[PDB]
Structures are given as C-alpha cells and as structure tokens.
Amino acid sequence: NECLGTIGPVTPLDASDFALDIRMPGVTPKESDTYFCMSMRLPVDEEAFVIDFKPRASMDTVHHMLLFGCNMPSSTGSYWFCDEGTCTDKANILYAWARNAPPTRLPKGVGFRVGGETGSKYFVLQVHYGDISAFRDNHKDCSGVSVHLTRVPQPLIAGMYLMMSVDTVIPPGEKVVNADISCQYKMYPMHVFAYRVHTHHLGKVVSGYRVRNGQWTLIGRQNPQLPQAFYPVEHPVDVTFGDILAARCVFTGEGRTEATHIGGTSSDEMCNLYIMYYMEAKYALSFMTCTKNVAPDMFRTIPAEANIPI
Numbered sequence: 001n002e003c004l005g006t007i008g009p010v011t012p013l014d015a016s017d018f019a020l021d022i023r024m025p026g027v028t029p030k031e032s033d034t035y036f037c038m039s040m041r042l043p044v045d046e047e048a049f050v051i052d053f054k055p056r057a058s059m060d061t062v063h064h065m066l067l068f069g070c071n072m073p074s075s076t077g078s079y080w081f082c083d084e085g086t087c088t089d090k091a092n093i094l095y096a097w098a099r100n101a102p103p104t105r106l107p108k109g110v111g112f113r114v115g116g117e118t119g120s121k122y123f124v125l126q127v128h129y130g131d132i133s134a135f136r137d138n139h140k141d142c143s144g145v146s147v148h149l150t151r152v153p154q155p156l157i158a159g160m161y162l163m164m165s166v167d168t169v170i171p172p173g174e175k176v177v178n179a180d181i182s183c184q185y186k187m188y189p190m191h192v193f194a195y196r197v198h199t200h201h202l203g204k205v206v207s208g209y210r211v212r213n214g215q216w217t218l219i220g221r222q223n224p225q226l227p228q229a230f231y232p233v234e235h236p237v238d239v240t241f242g243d244i245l246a247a248r249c250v251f252t253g254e255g256r257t258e259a260t261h262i263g264g265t266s267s268d269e270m271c272n273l274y275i276m277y278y279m280e281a282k283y284a285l286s287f288m289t290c291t292k293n294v295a296p297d298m299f300r301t302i303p304a305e306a307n308i309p310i
C-alpha cells in the first residue's frame with residue numbers, strides 16, 4: 001500500500017481514539033513466497049482496545065497477512081524474514097487477512113485489550129509475498145494493516161483460544177493420521193464468533209467442537225488448504241465451565257518419504273485451530289491454550305464430518 005511519508009503512522013480520530021498504520025518499510029521481495037515481518041511498539045503505555053482493522057495490501061503481490069500482539073518481537077530490525085522468528089514470547093494472533101477470503105469485522109462493542117501492565121506492548125506484522133511479477137520495477141512495498149485503538153473500555157473483550165498439537169508423528173506414506181486435541185473448559189463463559197485453521201501441506205481437514213453432556217456442537221470445520229482467514233462461525237456458540245473443547249486435524253503421509261512431525265518448516269506440520277471469542281469485560285481473559293488430549297476416548301463419538309474432506 002502507499003507509503004505514509006511525512007505524516008507518520010498515527011492518525012488522531014478524536015479525544016480517545018487513533019488509527020495506527022502498521023506497514024512494511026518499503027520492502028522489495030526478491031524470491032516468490034517471501035515472508036516478511038516487522039513490529040511497532042504501541043505509542044501509548046496505558047491500556048487501549050483494538051476495535052477495528054482495515055487491510056492495506058497490494059492485491060498484485062500480497063498473498064496473506066497476519067497481525068500479532070507480543071512483548072518481545074524476534075528481531076530489533078526494521079524488518080526481517082519471519083523464518084528467523086515472530087516473537088520471543090508467545091505471540092497472540094489478532095488478525096489474518098487472506099487474499100482470496102475477505103476478513104470479517106469485529107462485532108461492535110468488542111475489543112482486544114493491549115498495552116498497559118499485562119497487554120501486548122508490540123504489534124508484529126507478517127506479510128507473505130506470493131507473486132512478485134510486479135517487483136521487476138524494484139518498487140518497494142508498504143502493504144500492511146491499519147488498526148483502530150481507543151482508551152474507552154469495551155463491554156466485550158476479544159480473546160483467542162488456541163488448540164494445537166505438539167506430539168504428532170506422520171509416518172511416510174501413511175494414508176490417514178489423526179491429531180486429536182481436547183481440554184476441559186474452566187473459565188467464565190466465552191462466545192466463539194470466528195475461527196482460523198492452520199496446517200501445512202499434509203492437512204486434509206481441521207475441525208473443532210464444544211462437547212457438553214456427550215453432545216458435539218460444531219465450532220468450525222475447514223480445509224486447511226483453502227485461504228487461512230478467520231471465518232465467522234455458523235452460529236454463535238458459548239463454551240462454559242465443564243465443557244470440553246475437542247479438535248482433530250486429519251493428515252496424510254502420502255508423498256513423504258520420511259516421517260513428518262510437528263514443527264516450523266514446510267517439511268514439518270502443524271495442527272492449529274484458533275477460536276476467536278468474546279467475554280464480558282469483568283470476566284475476561286485474553287488467551288487460552290490447549291496442547292493436550294484429556295478425553296482421548298471421547299473421540300470415538302466424533303461426528304463423521306470430522307474425517308470427511310470439505
């Protein structure tokens with residue numbers, strides 16, 4: 001997107017609001033499939049709320065973008081190749097923009113809490129450059145995301161419940177390998193409103209469910225090879241203390257001559273189901289994670305859609 005120049009990245013909106021533009025510093029991708037990252041310290045130290053996001057991406061080159069909040073970006077640079085790392089600490093994903101799947105807006109009254117004593121101090125943007133035909137000009141790119149911040153406390157706080165595998169091993173040639181994840185929910189109620197799935201090339205399908213009284217309620221189901229944007233949930237789903245969140249990624253070993261385990265490269269795999277939710281401000285926590293399988297046997301009753309591609 002157009003580089004800002006002399007006006008800088010901060011646009012005052014009114015007494016308590018401002019837009020912060022998070023753009024690449026005029027970079028020029030040299031290889032296709034390049035992944036660039038950069039970070040912006042928040043301008044204010046006190047707590048603020050991110051209530052909106054507007055993509056500022058060049059359609060001819062940018063394939064996808066992801067925006068995280070964290071306290072220690074992986075590089076002190078102007079920008080860097082993300083394969084070096086995103087954040088030293090555990091990054092919280094806030095937004096994903098996919099070229100072929102237009103992002104959905106946050107419900108009004110819902111905001112991510114950042115800054116202050118416990119909120120993220122930085123935003124780290126990762127841009128994935130696919131086609132670079134437009135880059136023979138050796139033109140620089142300032143694609144990114146604009147974020148709307150406010151000091152006004154929001155009634156509903158947005159958070160992320162991340163379900164991910166750590167132990168998965170996919171034997172070469174192996175027709176079907178399931179990665180099951182399950183945890184019991186023990187916090188105040190959350191209402192899922194969006195979900196994103198993430199797998200590398202071996203993933204066939206990823207599904208997540210809320211299981212209450214043995215009954216399975218679909219949160220989201222998606223083919224991880226389709227654009228990995230946050231998609232709105234079919235129907236609002238609350239998860240309450242006692243419920244169990246269960247997820248399954250279906251992989252294959254077909255095509256691999258060696259075993260594939262969980263990891264950060266293209267030769268590795270990942271099984272992630274991001275569940276974006278909102279909670280009443282007075283009960284809210286911004287992030288939860290599940291990296292276990294507490295009810296392995298429970299999957300004997302998983303809906304068949306969980307094994308059939310989409």
Ligand SMILES: CC(=O)N[C@@H](Cc1cc(I)c(O)c(I)c1)C(=O)NCC(=O)O
Binds near residue numbers: 090093198272
């Ligand atoms: C090892 C793995 O599966 N990593 C995933 C999930 C992940 C993401 C964030 I944000 C975290 O803070 C943590 I802890 C783990 C991963 O990096 N996925 C990237 C993606 O979703 O595209």
Ligand SMILES: CC(=O)N[C@@H](Cc1cc(I)c(O)c(I)c1)C(=O)NCC(=O)O
Binds near residue numbers: 017052053146
């Ligand atoms: C005064 C105000 O809030 N104006 C905009 C907010 C805004 C402005 C810019 I410049 C941004 O880049 C972003 I992110 C958000 C407003 O009312 N936007 C409505 C909307 O499109 O959602």
Ligand SMILES: [Cu+2]
Binds near residue numbers: 065128
């Ligand atoms: Cu991409």
Ligand SMILES: [Cu+2]
Binds near residue numbers: 198199200264269270
């Ligand atoms: Cu990955």
Ligand code: NI
Binds near residue numbers: 191237
């Ligand atoms: Ni409800």
